[PDB]
Design a protein around this ligand. Structure first.
Ligand SMILES: Nc1ccn([C@@H]2O[C@H](COP(=O)(O)OP(=O)(O)OP(=O)(O)O)[C@@H](O)[C@H]2O)c(=O)n1
Ligand SMILES: C[S@@+](CC[C@H](N)C(=O)[O-])C[C@H]1O[C@@H](n2cnc3c(N)ncnc32)[C@H](O)[C@@H]1O
Ligand code: SF4
Ligand SMILES: [Cl-]
Length: 280
């Protein structure tokens, strides 16, 4: 298993409360910058070409984040450095200062109907304003702009083509709501995503309406369950499909930890996990 593409969820804290979140604020723990850099070095030596920064909200700690993006690009010479964020805490000067080391910046927006963004819980109804401003900043300092969308029971009938034809992200991830055991599957967890779930037919309603876009990347449940390399806030590997957890790579190493998780490389390539992820 060559971990060519890794998501490092370095924090679990966030400033929003989307009802379907499958990566909840279980801990406020965060790794040290020496340990995180060592973990990113360990993954580089195992073959990782693309790092993606995620978790709760990465831009809750823009000093920690920016330190790691300059590290991954200047020191580890990673092919792709990417970030996924809800966009609200991004400051323009941070983008300007770190544009050279960022290949992709992804901002989440699940609807362009701000009432549904309130119903979802991603804020108080300004996500589209946040969204367009992030994309404006990306095109200024020449970062590839990417958009992530979660298709729920409240927005699968939504026609988004006017906005997609305007933003024109180079990459548009379209997730079906995923139920992850122990994260959002009941009322004993920090979120109850059961009200947002849709069927394979309801998902296809949204997909057929929008698949014509080149950026469009459809990610149904079967393509999301085990197609990812999930790195914990302790730098452990998460198997969210099987509800399992490894020891931190900092102690047992990359290759020994990877052997405990399931990673569907077949679904990884089906979802176009490998792509032209570099430049600026
Ligand atoms: N079972 C899953 C599946 C996905 N994710 C997370 O969902 C997030 C959104 O995915 P995306 O932004 O598409 O991840 P990238 O790795 O950046 O995808 P790509 O490289 O293809 O752009 C990722 O952080 C991933 O870790 C997760 O927590 N649990
Ligand atoms: C968990 S978030 C955290 C990163 C950042 N705060 C953001 O929203 O972009 C990462 C991505 O996963 C998506 N996501 C969260 N919960 C999900 C679920 N249950 N099913 C599918 N996607 C989900 C979010 O919309 C976001 O695009
Ligand atoms: S999804 Fe909504 S809640 Fe879960 S992390 Fe990203 S922003 Fe915070
Ligand atoms: Cl672009």
């Amino acid at each position: 298993q060559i971990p060519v593409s890794v998501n490092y969820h370095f924090t679990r804290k966030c400033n929003k409360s989307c009802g379907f979140c499958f990566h909840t604020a279980k801990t406020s723990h965060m790794e040290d910058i020496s340990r995180a850099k060592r973990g990113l070095q360990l993954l580089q030596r195992a073959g990782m070409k693309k790092i993606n920064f995620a978790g709760g909200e990465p831009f809750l700690y823009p000093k920690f984040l920016g330190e790691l993006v300059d590290f991954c690009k200047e020191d580890l010479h990673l092919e792709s450095v990417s970030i996924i964020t809800n966009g609200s805490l991004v400051r323009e000067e941070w983008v300007r200062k770190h544009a050279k080391n960022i290949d992709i910046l992804a901002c989440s927006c699940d609807s362009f109907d701000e009432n549904m963004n309130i119903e979802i819980g991603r804020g108080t109804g300004n996500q589209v304003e946040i969204l367009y401003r992030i994309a404006k900043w990306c095109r200024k300092n020449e970062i590839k702009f990417k958009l992530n969308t979660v298709v729920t029971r409240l927005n699968y009938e939504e026609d988004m083509n006017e906005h997609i034809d305007t933003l024109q992200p180079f990459r548009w991830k379209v997730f079906q709501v995923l139920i992850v055991e122990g994260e959002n599957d009941s009322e004993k967890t920090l979120r109850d995503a059961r009200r947002f779930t849709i069927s394979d037919k309801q998902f296809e309603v949204f997909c057929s309406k929008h698949r014509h876009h080149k950026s469009f990347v459809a990610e149904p449940n079967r393509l999301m369950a085990s197609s990812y390399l999930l790195v914990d806030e302790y730098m452990r590997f998460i198997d969210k499909d099987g509800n399992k957890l490894t020891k931190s790579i900092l102690d047992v190493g990359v290759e020994a930890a990877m052997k405990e998780i399931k990673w569907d490389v077949d679904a990884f390539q089906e979802r176009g996990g490998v792509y032209e992820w570099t430049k600026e």
